[PDB]
Design a protein around this ligand. Structure first.
Ligand SMILES: O=C(N[C@@H]1[C@@H]2C[C@@H]3C[C@H]1C[C@@](O)(C3)C2)c1cnc(N[C@H]2CCOC2)nc1C1CCCC1
Ligand SMILES: O=C(N[C@@H]1[C@@H]2C[C@@H]3C[C@H]1C[C@@](O)(C3)C2)c1cnc(N[C@H]2CCOC2)nc1C1CCCC1
Ligand SMILES: O=C(N[C@@H]1[C@@H]2C[C@@H]3C[C@H]1C[C@@](O)(C3)C2)c1cnc(N[C@H]2CCOC2)nc1C1CCCC1
Ligand SMILES: O=C(N[C@@H]1[C@@H]2C[C@@H]3C[C@H]1C[C@@](O)(C3)C2)c1cnc(N[C@H]2CCOC2)nc1C1CCCC1
Ligand SMILES: O=C(N[C@@H]1[C@@H]2C[C@@H]3C[C@H]1C[C@@](O)(C3)C2)c1cnc(N[C@H]2CCOC2)nc1C1CCCC1
Ligand SMILES: O=C(N[C@@H]1[C@@H]2C[C@@H]3C[C@H]1C[C@@](O)(C3)C2)c1cnc(N[C@H]2CCOC2)nc1C1CCCC1
Lengths: 546, 546
């Protein structure tokens, strides 16, 4: 029974193969066929390329050795190398043309999800070229989806030498019959076959995956679209900033580039952005996913006034000051979305761009108190249940697992009313004791929220709703303003509280507003439709926030 | 007795003043003298500019209102505004010309160091211009040196209204006679004077500082060159990455731009980079100051082999992987400097550029064991004292305060021998029980190192020296390589162990090597000569690492 799958990089996980590109360069330069391969392989196990692949010399040390082999080959073939001949240029182009073979990576991901140990085994070099970052980025994106990365130049061995196969087996902690090995080089499969491993010669991706599908008995081709990459909390970089003596803010950080600050809703976590964090970092952004004040590993002071928007926004400004950031792109959802609009209104100099999921820009009504506004808008009547300190805390804290399983559901899986919360005296009054698990979440994901809420519970989170008068008076100071910085409003078709029509007057305040809209999406946008959220955010960030 | 000092931004902490620039624009556009000031002030307390300064409208909303005032003013003056007339362009140039008035900031810093509460009180706007980051960066650099920043547009009041002065006094928690107020606008001093504050009209910086020096009785002009900005540990963003099940690495992070990873020496801390962190962040870099493995808040496993260079380098690579960084600039000192050369040799694709303070690139001698090498080089004989587990730990842990006060001294303050450590049986055998405090450090800084070392002590730090054979065998694999990525070697004149001459053969291995050299500098480079270290590193980063 197969338990491990090994992939080569060049010609397998990354396409085109370097020598595929070079065959075309050879033809374009009108060189004799095979001259570059011949000069590359010159001396075989005793040659310059074996020294390179074993890590004895760097790629920059190897370049002139390859140039000399090309001259020797051309002299013997009685041909002249062209005037502009440069191994540096030729190899730079071949390395840069190489991109992840997405169907191959998808198959490796499916196998690992099904319990396989996966590895990359590659003949590679120590890259010290001025352009080395390109290949470093590619390797970084690939390696994180595998249990092991074995590089010839780091282990001092190369394929097809038999010792590297014994090293692979030792690394995998598996017998050869438990391994499936994929390579586009027939001579590199021979030692693996020799030991008793299943081997697949990768000539074309589709045929190779068909052989892999048959031997593993796992569907790899024609599969449903996979979810974006998620986060394992224990593998993230965790950051902590004290904004004031009693308040520290926790965040998860990933990537490099413009800072993108993600602000979750109620009652959530930095983990609500799990499908966005890897995607936004891969897209070229430095992601800062907050635990907002009152949540997770951030401080949760008991006082209501610690959660008014003016205080919360001031603290987010301090957060940027202490990290040494003049600006960040602010992306919010739900209560986070409300906060980000207000960051754009009061601190535009610190906000590079602003985006909200579901929450429209809600201006203060100077002619009505927030309680009179709730009276005139009964879709928000449930917020009255959140007013009295202790009442909603008692219901939400009674059974954390039940709380999160009842809340985090798709539009069609709703177990909550919302419209009759006050009349019924609670959120879960007509909800089951043991709700089924939504198709959106796994039991493990639910238990992470349960664990997070065991620290401070719901007092801090509910206090976000307990500052209506303070928030109203503060928001009234901004009534003569317009939001003129780059802005995106994303609506969700099936959010029955934050309906898309609630955002219809936003252009009155934000004239240059850009929009996104997600079909068949409920309230929990990030986990309901992660692929769609990612596409919308990346397109907008790349056009408006760079 | 004066206890607080208040500074204006425009024309005081930042020069030139906006209207200084505009006087020149007026003349260049051949406009009637005072037309821009007149259109700017139009309507006084009821005008567009008062609304802007109170935060009622944003700068972008104000721009066309100012344009209309300019048209009204030109019509009345019977003049035509030029064809190319643009308030947007005119104001963008004036805002961008404004730079920190370094002598004024220096004086504010001296007063705060002497116990004054300091504040910035400014007539400012909500900046939503596409170019707003310029001013956001300036305000960010300035505000962090002050106890308070009071902005007209955030408080809804403007100078010279009397209420803003009462607000200032409430914020300061001081009586008016305890305050010195500096402003370049005479009408803005009148309400402060009216309340009983000391006022200084800032016409020229030198004269204003002379008045300030006389009234406070504190020397502000002609002072010695101040030290660079340091770090207060409780105000930094602290980051934590698990690199493997039992190992977590702690770092302090500040700034945005290319990642710069700072690697301290033995027996140090992230805090050894305190004078570099703010300077490198201000210079346009994202600084990651490590607690290296075995130190501070990073893990300190007991096993010797956990501290061999191969393991330490692999972990730093994992650190980059988990943070989502394809590369970082690696800057090391002492043991950190040794590690960074090896990162450049084994992982060039992950190293954007490399710099070492004091530690030359030390290649392995394949013909001698590291013990035979120490026998032939007695300057390193003291390292034999570090070999036996427990011996050096007992001496270094006996009295932490004595340990750090004896080690951290200028070249001329040495209390250690080094050349007779083995013969004498310890580092502090002929050192006083109560050493004096070096001119390099304060008691508070010493106590931070004492606190850090109470967690894990010296076992992990000393284990860095206990892997000579493993490190030698690993380093031998790199003997055919050259370091061809951007590299800087900084020598210290008076480091009597890591002498500048020890770096003399480095060009044999690093042909494109760049150099720095610091006169009258001992071993503890970062704190001995911080201004010089900062100048050298920033110049090199800006030329070779961007
Ligand atoms: O690894 C290869 N060659 C090795 C070198 C040279 C020789 C033979 C082996 C072992 C050595 O020790 C000696 C080091 C090798 C062999 N064939 C192909 N392409 C094939 C697929 C398409 O075109 C041919 N590509 C490579 C490298 C993979 C990354 C860059 C090229
Ligand atoms: O209360 C909500 N959001 C906040 C309100 C309204 C808006 C957005 C934020 C911040 C506000 O300031 C403005 C106050 C809110 C909004 N929409 C939904 N959609 C439900 C549909 C089914 O699942 C949840 N649910 C909630 C709560 C989340 C759990 C219990 C109800
Ligand atoms: O939904 C509103 N306010 C919020 C509700 C009720 C209150 C106050 C805020 C925050 C809440 O949490 C509590 C949720 C609300 C209230 N009044 C008006 N317009 C008014 C002016 C013209 O006609 C009515 N508009 C809105 C939304 C903004 C555009 C479409 C609807
Ligand atoms: O704050 C100023 N004016 C105020 C506006 C307009 C008027 C008068 C006050 C109070 C207002 O409410 C009404 C708002 C004001 C006054 N004088 C000068 N420059 C001086 C130094 C060099 O040139 C003149 N500069 C300013 C501003 C400081 C930043 C941008 C210009
Ligand atoms: O041991 C040192 N550094 C390491 C050695 C030598 C070099 C650099 C690192 C890493 C090595 O691998 C290579 C091993 C080392 C180097 N120079 C000095 N200069 C003294 C002068 C007065 O103050 C300290 N001091 C030390 C120790 C620091 C406290 C006790 C002695
Ligand atoms: O200092 C050396 N090695 C280190 C010392 C001794 C041992 C080994 C390393 C690391 C230590 O921690 C322990 C400190 C050392 C040893 N041997 C040689 N060259 C040899 C080849 C030609 O002549 C001698 N060169 C050096 C330095 C590199 C250039 C100038 C001096």
């Amino acid at each position: 029974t197969l338990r491990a799958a090994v992939f080569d990089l060049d010609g397998v996980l990354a396409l085109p193969a370097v020598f595929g590109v070079l065959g075309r360069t050879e033809e374009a330069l009108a060189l004799p066929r095979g001259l570059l391969n011949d000069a590359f392989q010159k001396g075989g196990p005793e040659g310059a390329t074996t020294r390179l692949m074993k890590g004895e010399i760097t790629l920059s040390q190897w370049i002139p050795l390859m140039e000399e082999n090309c001259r020797k080959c051309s002299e013997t073939a009685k041909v002249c190398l062209p005037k502009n001949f440069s191994i540096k240029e030729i190899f730079d182009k071949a390395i840069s043309a190489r991109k992840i073979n997405r169907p191959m990576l998808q198959a490796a991901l499916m196998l690992r999800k099904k319990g396989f140990t996966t590895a990359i085994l590659t003949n590679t070099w120590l890259d010290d070229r001025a352009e080395r970052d390109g290949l470093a980025q590619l390797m970084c994106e690939l390696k994180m989806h595998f249990d092991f990365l074995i590089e010839s130049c780091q282990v001092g061995m190369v394929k097809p030498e038999p010792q590297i196969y014994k090293f692979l087996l030792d690394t995998l902690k598996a017998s050869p019959s438990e391994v499936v090995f994929l390579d586009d080089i027939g001579a590199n499969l021979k030692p693996a076959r020799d030991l008793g491993m299943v081997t697949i010669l990768v000539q074309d991706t589709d045929t190779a995956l068909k052989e892999l599908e048959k031997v593993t008995g796992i569907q790899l081709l024609n599969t449903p679209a996979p979810l974006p990459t998620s986060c394992n909390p224990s593998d993230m970089s965790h950051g902590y900033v004290t904004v004031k003596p009693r308040v520290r803010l926790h965040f998860v950080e990933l990537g490099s580039g413009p800072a993108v600050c993600l602000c979750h809703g109620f009652p959530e976590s930095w983990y609500s952005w799990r499908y966005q964090i890897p995607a936004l970092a891969q897209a070229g952004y430095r992601v800062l996913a907050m635990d907002m004040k009152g949540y997770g590993e951030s401080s949760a002071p008991p006082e209501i006034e610690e959660y008014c928007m003016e205080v919360l926004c001031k603290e987010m400004v301090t957060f940027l000051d202490k990290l040494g950031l003049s600006q960040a792109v602010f992306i919010g959802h739900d209560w986070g979305g409300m906060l980000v609009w207000y960051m754009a209104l009061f601190y535009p100099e610190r906000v590079r761009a602003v985006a909200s999921l579901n929450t429209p820009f809600i201006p203060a009504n100077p002619n009505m108190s927030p309680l009179e506004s709730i009276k005139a808008n009964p879709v928000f009547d449930y917020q009255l249940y959140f007013q009295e300190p202790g009442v909603a805390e008692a219901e939400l804290e009674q059974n954390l697992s039940r709380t999160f399983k009842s809340l985090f559901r798709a539009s069609d899986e709703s177990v909550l009313s919302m419209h009759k919360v006050c009349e019924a005296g609670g959120l879960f009054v007509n909800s089951p004791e043991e709700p089924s698990l939504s198709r959106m979440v796994t039991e493990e994901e639910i238990q992470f929220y349960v664990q997070q809420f065991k620290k401070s519970g719901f007092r801090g989170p509910l206090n976000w709703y307990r500052n209506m008068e303070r928030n109203w008076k503060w928001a009234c100071k901004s009534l003569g303003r317009k939001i003129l910085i780059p802005a995106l409003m994303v609506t969700a078709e099936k959010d029955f509280v934050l309906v898309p029509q609630m955002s219809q007057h936003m252009e009155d305040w934000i004239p240059h507003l850009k929009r996104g809209h997600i079909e068949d999406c409920g309230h929990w946008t990030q986990m309901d439709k992660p692929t769609e959220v990612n596409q919308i955010l990346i397109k907008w960030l790349d056009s408006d926030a760079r």
